[PDB]
Design a protein around this ligand. Structure first.
Ligand SMILES: CC(=O)N1CCN(c2ccc(-c3nc(NCCc4ccccc4)c4ccc(N)cc4n3)cc2)CC1
Length: 327
């Protein structure tokens, strides 16, 4: 067991191993930048807020730790460390997660060669995440961290602007390509400097999407199980799919083509992350021998209904069994 030291930061007491120095608040649970004396690198230390106050929080804490412990990929945030000051399960109340400090998010931060490299890395990270049967579900520029030489990592598994239309419309059985929709929205915004679909609410959001991609055809309508959803669709004035070359004028034609394959209303026909990596737009980065998949991820706990102290004990287990990665 390491030696801890305590301090007050903003309104919170932080108790962390002496390993971590120079704690400096970055955001509010709450995050501090720190200096990792073991590695010489800067890290982000997140202190979770009320991690076990309810069943829902307890399961969410467990879920976040399990996910972070699983991710081992250059384009996905991974867990450098996890610790608690508690010496036993009985006094276990606080959880700290340690990750690489990334420079800035993509919302803060383009040339076509920069868009190529950034979207390539997102898709590389998504191929990995999707191969574990994990769906990010909330991809957006603020969930994409980039450092100064344009290396990107996905973290944190308006919001609505990047959300797949089948999620807006409340479909229960959506697939992993909801994330590809988000990548398409992000890529469009990097190419044009403008939010693709800046809807004011959920109905406006769908109206903006349908203006670009067109109203569903009969091929899509015959797969829609909801009578109300089918009628809503067939009630709107049919819009033709717009020609993407017209909308994204002057963009690299290969980028227009990939956007056409990502921003498809029918998610059965939307391109996958693995397929997108092989698209000609990424010709100078694509390496099928260096786009790895993930180990299988046991998601069975999602279907379980447990007590607060049970989720809490399972989380404690995962803290104790954590093995730091090689330096
Ligand atoms: C609880 C409740 O009120 N519900 C009403 C809506 N509802 C619903 C909504 C969408 C779909 C749905 N959508 C797709 N895509 C959304 C299409 C779309 C079209 C216009 C505007 C927004 C989304 C699909 C795509 C492929 C596929 N194989 C099946 C698809 N299936 C299914 C059920 C069921 C739940």
């Amino acid at each position: 067991r390491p030696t801890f030291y305590r301090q007050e930061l903003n309104k919170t007491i932080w108790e962390v191993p002496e390993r971590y120095q120079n704690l400096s608040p970055v955001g509010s649970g709450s995050v501090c930048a720190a200096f990792d004396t073991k590695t010489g690198l800067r890290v982000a230390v997140k202190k979770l807020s009320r991690p076990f106050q309810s069943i829902i929080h307890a399961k969410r804490t467990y879920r976040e730790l399990r996910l972070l412990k699983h991710m081992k990929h250059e384009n996905v945030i991974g867990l450098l460390d996890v610790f608690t000051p508690a010496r036993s399960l009985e006094e276990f109340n606080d959880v700290y997660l340690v990750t690489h400090l990334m420079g800035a998010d993509l919302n803060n931060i383009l040339t076509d060669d920069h868009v190529q490299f950034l979207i390539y890395q997102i898709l590389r990270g998504l191929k990995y995440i999707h191969s574990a049967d994990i769906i990010h579900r909330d991809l957006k520029p603020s969930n994409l961290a980039v450092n100064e030489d344009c290396e990107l990592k996905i973290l944190d598994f308006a919001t609505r602007w990047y959300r797949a239309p089948e999620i807006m419309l409340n479909w229960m059985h959506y697939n992993q390509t909801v994330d590809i929709w988000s990548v398409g929205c992000i890529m469009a915004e990097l190419l044009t400097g403008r939010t693709l679909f800046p809807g004011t609410d959920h109905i406006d959001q769908l109206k903006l999407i349908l203006r670009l991609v067109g109203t569903p055809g009969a091929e899509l309508l015959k797969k829609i199980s909801s009578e109300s959803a089918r009628n809503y669709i067939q009630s709107l004035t049919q819009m033709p799919k717009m020609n993407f070359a017209n909308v994204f004028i002057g963009a690299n034609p290969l980028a227009v083509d990939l956007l056409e394959k990502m921003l498809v209303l029918d998610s059965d026909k939307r391109i996958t992350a693995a397929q997108a990596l092989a698209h000609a737009y990424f010709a100078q980065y694509h390496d099928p021998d260096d786009e790895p998949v993930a180990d299988p991820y046991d998601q069975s706990f999602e279907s379980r209904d447990l007590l607060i102290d049970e989720w809490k004990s399972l989380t404690y287990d995962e803290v104790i069994s954590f093995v730091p990665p090689p330096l």
